[PDB]
Coordinates of C-alpha atoms in Angstrom, one line a residue:
Chain A
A1 CA -41.8 112.2 33.3
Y2 CA -41.5 108.4 32.7
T3 CA -42.7 105.2 30.8
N4 CA -42.3 101.5 30.7
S5 CA -39.4 99.8 29.6
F6 CA -41.1 96.5 28.7
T7 CA -38.1 94.2 27.6
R8 CA -35.7 96.0 25.8
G9 CA -32.1 96.7 26.5
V10 CA -30.7 93.3 26.2
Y11 CA -27.4 93.3 23.8
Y12 CA -25.2 90.5 22.9
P13 CA -22.9 90.2 26.2
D14 CA -19.7 88.0 24.1
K15 CA -18.9 87.7 20.7
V16 CA -19.9 84.0 20.9
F17 CA -22.2 82.1 18.6
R18 CA -24.6 79.7 20.5
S19 CA -27.8 77.9 19.0
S20 CA -30.7 76.1 20.0
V21 CA -29.5 76.8 23.5
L22 CA -30.4 78.8 26.9
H23 CA -27.3 80.5 28.4
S24 CA -27.1 82.6 31.5
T25 CA -24.9 86.0 32.3
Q26 CA -24.4 88.3 35.0
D27 CA -23.5 92.0 33.8
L28 CA -24.5 95.4 33.4
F29 CA -28.1 95.6 31.8
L30 CA -31.4 97.7 31.9
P31 CA -33.9 95.8 33.8
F32 CA -37.4 94.6 32.6
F33 CA -40.5 96.7 33.2
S34 CA -37.9 99.8 34.9
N35 CA -39.0 103.4 34.5
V36 CA -37.3 105.0 31.7
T37 CA -37.1 108.8 31.5
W38 CA -39.6 110.1 29.0
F39 CA -38.4 113.7 26.4
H40 CA -38.8 115.4 23.4
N41 CA -32.9 117.2 26.9
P42 CA -30.7 118.5 29.8
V43 CA -27.0 117.0 30.5
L44 CA -27.3 114.0 32.3
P45 CA -25.5 111.7 34.7
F46 CA -23.9 108.3 33.0
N47 CA -24.1 105.9 36.2
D48 CA -22.5 102.8 35.2
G49 CA -24.1 102.8 31.8
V50 CA -26.8 104.3 29.6
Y51 CA -29.6 102.9 27.4
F52 CA -30.8 105.6 25.1
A53 CA -33.4 105.3 22.4
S54 CA -35.3 107.8 19.9
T55 CA -38.7 107.6 17.6
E56 CA -36.5 108.2 14.5
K57 CA -37.8 109.1 11.1
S58 CA -34.8 111.4 9.2
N59 CA -31.4 110.7 11.4
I60 CA -32.6 114.0 13.5
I61 CA -29.8 113.5 16.7
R62 CA -26.3 115.2 15.4
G63 CA -24.5 113.2 18.1
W64 CA -23.7 112.6 21.7
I65 CA -20.9 113.9 24.4
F66 CA -19.3 112.1 27.6
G67 CA -17.0 112.9 30.3
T68 CA -16.4 114.1 33.7
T69 CA -16.3 118.1 32.8
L70 CA -17.8 118.0 29.3
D71 CA -16.2 121.5 29.4
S72 CA -12.1 121.3 29.0
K73 CA -9.4 120.0 31.5
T74 CA -9.5 116.7 29.6
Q75 CA -10.3 115.2 26.3
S76 CA -14.4 114.4 26.7
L77 CA -15.7 112.1 24.2
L78 CA -17.3 113.5 21.1
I79 CA -19.3 111.4 18.8
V80 CA -21.2 112.8 15.8
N81 CA -23.5 111.3 12.8
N82 CA -23.1 111.7 9.1
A83 CA -26.2 110.1 6.9
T84 CA -25.8 106.3 8.3
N85 CA -22.3 106.6 9.5
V86 CA -20.5 108.1 12.9
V87 CA -17.7 110.3 13.6
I88 CA -15.7 110.3 16.5
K89 CA -13.1 112.3 18.5
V90 CA -12.0 113.0 22.1
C91 CA -11.7 116.8 22.6
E92 CA -11.4 119.3 25.4
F93 CA -13.7 121.7 24.1
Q94 CA -15.4 124.2 26.6
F95 CA -18.8 125.0 24.6
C96 CA -22.0 126.7 26.0
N97 CA -25.2 124.8 26.1
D98 CA -25.1 125.1 22.1
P99 CA -22.2 123.0 21.1
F100 CA -24.1 121.8 17.7
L101 CA -23.2 125.6 16.7
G102 CA -19.6 125.6 18.4
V103 CA -18.5 122.6 16.5
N104 CA -5.9 118.6 22.3
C105 CA -7.0 115.3 20.7
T106 CA -5.5 111.7 21.7
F107 CA -8.1 109.4 19.5
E108 CA -9.9 109.7 16.5
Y109 CA -12.4 107.5 14.4
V110 CA -14.9 107.7 11.3
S111 CA -17.4 104.6 10.3
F112 CA -41.5 108.4 14.7
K113 CA -41.6 105.4 11.7
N114 CA -38.3 104.1 13.5
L115 CA -37.2 103.0 16.8
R116 CA -33.3 103.6 17.4
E117 CA -31.8 102.0 20.3
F118 CA -28.2 102.4 22.1
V119 CA -26.3 101.0 24.8
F120 CA -23.2 103.4 25.9
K121 CA -21.0 101.2 28.3
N122 CA -17.2 101.8 29.9
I123 CA -15.6 98.4 30.8
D124 CA -12.6 99.8 32.5
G125 CA -11.0 97.3 29.7
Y126 CA -12.0 100.4 27.8
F127 CA -15.5 101.6 26.2
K128 CA -18.2 100.3 24.0
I129 CA -21.3 100.8 22.0
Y130 CA -24.1 98.6 21.3
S131 CA -27.3 99.2 18.5
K132 CA -30.3 98.5 17.2
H133 CA -33.1 99.8 14.4
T134 CA -36.4 98.7 13.8
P135 CA -39.5 100.1 11.8
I136 CA -42.5 100.7 14.9
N137 CA -46.0 102.1 15.0
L138 CA -46.2 105.8 14.8
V139 CA -46.6 105.9 19.1
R140 CA -44.5 107.8 21.3
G141 CA -44.1 105.0 23.9
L142 CA -41.7 102.2 23.5
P143 CA -43.7 99.3 21.9
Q144 CA -43.8 96.4 24.0
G145 CA -41.7 93.8 21.8
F146 CA -37.9 92.0 21.8
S147 CA -34.5 92.4 20.0
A148 CA -31.1 92.4 21.5
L149 CA -28.6 95.5 20.8
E150 CA -25.6 94.3 18.6
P151 CA -21.8 95.7 19.2
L152 CA -20.5 98.9 16.9
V153 CA -17.3 100.1 18.3
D154 CA -14.5 99.6 21.3
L155 CA -13.0 103.1 21.8
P156 CA -9.4 102.2 23.3
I157 CA -9.1 105.6 24.9
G158 CA -9.4 105.4 28.7
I159 CA -11.6 108.7 29.3
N160 CA -13.6 109.0 32.7
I161 CA -17.2 109.3 32.0
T162 CA -19.4 110.6 34.9
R163 CA -22.0 112.5 32.9
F164 CA -23.1 112.7 28.8
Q165 CA -25.2 115.3 26.7
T166 CA -27.3 114.9 23.0
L167 CA -26.4 117.4 19.9
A168 CA -39.2 112.5 17.8
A169 CA -40.0 111.4 21.6
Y170 CA -36.8 110.1 23.0
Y171 CA -35.9 107.9 26.4
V172 CA -32.8 107.3 28.9
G173 CA -32.6 104.2 31.4
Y174 CA -29.6 103.1 33.2
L175 CA -27.6 99.6 33.7
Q176 CA -27.5 97.4 36.4
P177 CA -25.7 94.6 37.7
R178 CA -27.9 91.8 37.3
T179 CA -28.1 88.1 35.9
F180 CA -30.2 87.3 32.9
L181 CA -31.2 84.3 30.8
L182 CA -30.7 84.3 26.9
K183 CA -32.4 82.2 24.3
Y184 CA -30.5 81.4 21.5
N185 CA -32.3 80.5 17.9
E186 CA -30.9 78.0 15.2
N187 CA -29.3 81.3 13.4
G188 CA -27.0 82.6 16.2
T189 CA -29.5 85.2 17.5
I190 CA -30.7 86.2 20.9
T191 CA -34.5 85.7 20.3
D192 CA -35.9 85.9 24.0
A193 CA -34.8 86.8 27.5
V194 CA -35.6 86.5 31.3
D195 CA -34.5 89.2 33.8
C196 CA -33.8 86.9 36.4
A197 CA -34.6 89.4 39.5
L198 CA -37.9 90.5 38.2
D199 CA -40.3 88.5 40.2
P200 CA -40.5 84.9 41.7
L201 CA -41.6 83.5 38.5
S202 CA -38.9 84.8 36.7
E203 CA -36.3 83.6 39.2
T204 CA -37.9 79.9 39.1
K205 CA -37.3 80.5 34.9
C206 CA -33.6 81.2 35.9
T207 CA -33.3 78.5 38.6
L208 CA -33.9 75.8 36.3
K209 CA -32.3 77.3 33.2
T210 CA -35.7 77.0 31.3
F211 CA -38.7 79.4 30.0
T212 CA -41.1 76.7 30.6
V213 CA -41.8 75.6 34.6
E214 CA -44.0 72.5 35.4
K215 CA -46.3 72.4 38.7
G216 CA -44.8 72.0 41.7
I217 CA -42.9 73.9 44.4
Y218 CA -39.1 75.0 43.7
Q219 CA -36.3 76.1 46.1
Chain B
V1 CA 14.1 111.1 12.0
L2 CA 11.3 108.4 12.7
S3 CA 9.9 109.1 16.3
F4 CA 7.7 106.3 18.3
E5 CA 5.6 107.5 21.2
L6 CA 3.9 105.3 23.6
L7 CA 0.9 106.2 25.9
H8 CA -1.8 104.3 27.5
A9 CA -3.8 104.6 24.4
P10 CA -4.3 101.0 22.8
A11 CA -1.7 100.7 19.6
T12 CA -3.2 100.9 16.6
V13 CA -0.3 101.0 14.1
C14 CA 1.4 97.4 13.9
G15 CA 3.0 95.5 11.2
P16 CA 2.8 92.0 9.9
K17 CA 0.7 89.6 11.8
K18 CA 1.2 85.6 12.7
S19 CA -0.5 83.2 10.6
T20 CA -0.6 79.7 8.7
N21 CA -2.2 77.8 5.7
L22 CA -5.6 76.5 7.0
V23 CA -5.7 72.6 6.8
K24 CA -9.5 71.1 6.9
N25 CA -10.6 67.3 8.0
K26 CA -7.3 66.6 9.7
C27 CA -6.7 66.3 13.1
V28 CA -4.5 69.6 13.9
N29 CA -3.3 71.8 16.1
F30 CA -4.7 75.2 15.8
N31 CA -4.9 79.2 17.2
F32 CA -7.7 81.7 15.8
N33 CA -7.2 84.8 17.2
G34 CA -5.7 83.6 20.7
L35 CA -8.3 80.6 20.7
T36 CA -5.8 77.9 20.9
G37 CA -6.6 74.1 20.6
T38 CA -6.5 70.6 18.7
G39 CA -8.9 68.9 16.9
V40 CA -10.2 68.0 13.3
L41 CA -11.4 71.2 11.6
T42 CA -14.3 71.3 9.1
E43 CA -16.7 72.9 7.1
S44 CA -20.0 74.5 8.4
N45 CA -23.2 75.9 7.9
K46 CA -23.4 77.7 11.0
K47 CA -24.8 81.3 10.5
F48 CA -22.5 83.1 12.6
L49 CA -23.6 86.9 13.1
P50 CA -21.2 89.3 11.8
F51 CA -19.3 90.4 15.3
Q52 CA -19.1 86.7 16.2
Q53 CA -15.9 84.9 16.4
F54 CA -16.2 81.9 18.6
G55 CA -19.1 79.1 18.7
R56 CA -20.1 76.9 21.8
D57 CA -22.2 73.7 22.2
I58 CA -24.4 73.0 25.2
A59 CA -21.9 71.9 27.9
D60 CA -20.3 75.1 27.2
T61 CA -17.2 73.4 24.7
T62 CA -16.2 75.3 21.7
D63 CA -17.8 73.8 18.5
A64 CA -16.9 76.4 15.7
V65 CA -14.7 79.2 14.9
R66 CA -14.5 81.9 11.9
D67 CA -11.3 82.2 9.9
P68 CA -10.1 85.7 10.4
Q69 CA -8.8 85.6 7.0
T70 CA -11.7 84.7 5.3
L71 CA -15.8 84.3 5.5
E72 CA -15.5 80.7 6.6
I73 CA -17.0 79.5 9.7
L74 CA -15.4 76.2 10.6
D75 CA -16.6 73.5 12.9
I76 CA -14.3 72.2 15.2
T77 CA -14.5 68.3 15.6
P78 CA -12.3 67.0 18.8
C79 CA -9.4 64.5 18.5
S80 CA -10.7 61.1 17.8
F81 CA -9.9 59.5 20.7
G82 CA -11.2 56.3 23.1
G83 CA -9.9 53.4 25.6
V84 CA -8.0 50.7 24.5
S85 CA -9.0 47.5 25.6
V86 CA -6.9 44.0 25.2
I87 CA -9.3 40.8 25.0
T88 CA -7.1 37.5 25.8
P89 CA -7.9 34.0 26.8
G90 CA -5.9 33.2 30.0
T91 CA -2.0 32.8 29.9
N92 CA -2.0 29.5 31.1
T93 CA -3.8 28.4 28.0
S94 CA -2.6 30.8 25.1
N95 CA -0.2 34.3 24.6
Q96 CA -2.5 35.3 21.7
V97 CA -4.5 38.8 22.1
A98 CA -6.9 40.9 20.6
Chain C
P1 CA -43.5 41.4 19.0
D2 CA -44.4 42.7 15.4
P3 CA -42.4 40.9 13.2
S4 CA -42.7 43.5 10.0
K5 CA -40.6 45.9 12.4
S6 CA -36.0 46.2 16.1
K7 CA -38.9 43.7 16.6
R8 CA -40.9 44.9 19.7
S9 CA -44.2 44.9 20.7
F10 CA -46.9 47.8 20.2
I11 CA -46.8 48.7 23.9
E12 CA -42.7 48.2 23.8
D13 CA -42.7 51.2 20.9
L14 CA -44.5 53.8 23.0
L15 CA -42.1 52.9 25.9
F16 CA -38.9 53.4 23.8
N17 CA -40.7 56.7 22.2
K18 CA -42.0 58.3 25.7
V19 CA -38.4 58.3 27.2
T20 CA -36.3 60.7 25.9
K21 CA -19.4 66.8 25.8
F22 CA -16.1 64.8 25.1
Chain D
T1 CA -4.7 49.0 29.2
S2 CA -4.5 52.5 27.7
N3 CA -6.1 55.7 26.0
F4 CA -5.9 55.8 21.9
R5 CA -5.8 59.7 21.0
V6 CA -5.1 60.5 17.0
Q7 CA -2.3 63.2 17.0
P8 CA -1.9 66.9 15.8
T9 CA -0.7 66.0 12.4
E10 CA 0.5 69.5 11.9
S11 CA 0.0 73.0 13.8
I12 CA -2.1 76.1 12.5
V13 CA -2.5 79.6 13.1
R14 CA -5.0 82.5 11.8
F15 CA -5.2 86.1 12.8
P16 CA -6.6 89.2 10.4
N17 CA -4.7 90.4 7.2
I18 CA -2.9 93.3 8.3
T19 CA -2.7 94.7 4.7
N20 CA -4.2 98.4 4.0
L21 CA -2.7 101.4 1.7
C22 CA -1.5 104.3 4.3
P23 CA 0.9 106.8 3.4
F24 CA 3.6 106.5 5.5
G25 CA 6.7 106.6 3.1
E26 CA 5.2 110.4 1.5
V27 CA 8.2 112.1 3.8
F28 CA 10.8 110.2 1.9
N29 CA 10.1 110.8 -1.8
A30 CA 8.5 114.4 -1.4
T31 CA 9.5 117.8 -2.4
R32 CA 8.3 120.2 0.6
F33 CA 11.1 120.2 3.0
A34 CA 11.9 123.1 5.4
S35 CA 15.1 123.4 7.1
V36 CA 16.7 122.8 10.7
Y37 CA 15.5 125.8 12.2
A38 CA 11.6 125.3 10.9
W39 CA 11.2 121.7 10.7
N40 CA 7.9 120.3 10.5
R41 CA 6.4 117.4 11.8
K42 CA 3.9 114.8 10.2
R43 CA 1.6 112.7 12.2
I44 CA 1.1 109.6 10.6
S45 CA -1.3 106.9 12.7
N46 CA -4.6 105.5 13.0
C47 CA -3.8 103.3 10.2
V48 CA -1.1 100.1 9.2
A49 CA 2.3 100.1 8.1
Chain E
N1 CA -27.2 61.0 34.7
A2 CA -27.4 64.0 32.3
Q3 CA -26.9 66.4 35.5
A4 CA -24.0 64.8 36.6
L5 CA -22.2 64.4 33.3
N6 CA -23.0 68.1 32.6
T7 CA -22.0 69.1 36.1
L8 CA -18.9 67.3 35.8
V9 CA -18.3 68.9 32.4
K10 CA -18.7 72.5 33.6
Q11 CA -16.3 71.9 36.7
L12 CA -13.5 72.1 33.8
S13 CA -14.2 76.0 33.4
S14 CA -14.5 76.9 37.3
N15 CA -11.1 78.3 38.6
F16 CA -10.9 76.9 42.1
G17 CA -9.2 80.0 43.0
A18 CA -6.3 79.5 40.5
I19 CA -5.5 82.5 38.0
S20 CA -7.7 81.2 34.7
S21 CA -9.4 77.3 34.3
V22 CA -7.9 77.8 30.7
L23 CA -5.2 75.9 31.2
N24 CA -3.3 77.3 28.0
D25 CA -3.3 80.8 29.7
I26 CA -1.1 79.6 32.8
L27 CA 1.0 77.5 30.4
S28 CA 1.8 80.6 28.3
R29 CA 1.8 83.5 31.1
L30 CA 4.0 82.2 33.9
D31 CA 7.5 80.9 34.6
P32 CA 7.0 76.8 35.5
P33 CA 8.0 77.4 39.1
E34 CA 4.9 79.7 39.6
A35 CA 2.9 77.9 36.9
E36 CA 3.1 74.4 38.7
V37 CA 1.1 76.3 41.7
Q38 CA -1.3 77.3 39.6
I39 CA -1.8 74.1 37.8
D40 CA -1.8 72.4 41.1
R41 CA -4.9 74.4 42.4
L42 CA -6.7 73.4 39.1
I43 CA -5.5 69.7 39.9
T44 CA -6.7 69.8 43.2
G45 CA -10.1 71.3 42.0
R46 CA -10.7 69.1 38.8
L47 CA -9.7 66.0 41.3
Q48 CA -12.2 66.7 43.8
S49 CA -14.6 67.2 41.2

């Protein structure tokens, strides 16, 4: 089953303040109007990077696991949530399909009313996480609206990842190497965007480095 | 016996760090977290988000920085500079110049 | 010219208004 | 004839403040000491010193 | 004239096949023999710009 992503999955690409300005970047991003997979469960591929989101109420989701095996032979990445905060470790566990009941390490760290959104990314220059939390209308499908995901951590771990698993409705999509245009308000904040490849009008906006296009013809 | 092991993981156990006093409103050479430059460092009201470290103008040139030892978001003005031109009457008539 | 004002004319003011790193 | 340029009056560096409380010298002034036959190992990492 | 000046400024950040367009990278990372080749690439680029 599938659902429309609208304009979600934008995130701050660098630790740079900009104001009242349009800036452009090429990176792994979720395409606009892409089909996310609908859920309300199995192990899934990571591809080059994961977008994950859920219609939260009481922080139901307990965590995530990432790796090549997720089943010993290497320290697979483990992430867990306690209250408003996060516990992280890399572990050679070999649990069955109930790792939440199952409960050689080289790294460890500790930090429908709502929508929570996350991006999980490998840069090869180590691994990073970006996030957002908002209220929403109680609809199961992702509402049409805009805000950017903000960084939480860099994990200096070097772990090989090709799949992930999870410990409300929820959604998964995949990042793609794409150019984007990003609008910054006065207060340093990404506040509108264009996916450059989406359609010829979007490509025109990105050709001009603008959001408004006057009448005419443009190469 | 104190042992030290170095692997491929990023080092998270360091010691004391490189830094100086911070001088406002004068032309100064500077480094912030490895961002080197020179100019007049000044105060600012520019609302950096908590993860943002540096700020840039429309032409990509740096205009602001976070002080890593405080909450201060500085604005960086370039060095004051300009062409120098000599006004002269013809040397056949006088040697005075401005 | 308007003497009450840069002592431009009225039509010169429209022209100076419409027309719009280191 | 030339370009004027107000010189750097002095030089500055800024990086984060290291300092934090981590039990590093706990093995120095401790009490529970074993022997060379069954020596113990204390892992002190993920902090500053 | 705005497009000309902004394009002339943005070309400072282009690498022209050199290791970095931030000149202080080359001056801190490489020894003078090699640094001269990387700077000469940036000079050739910025000058042609």
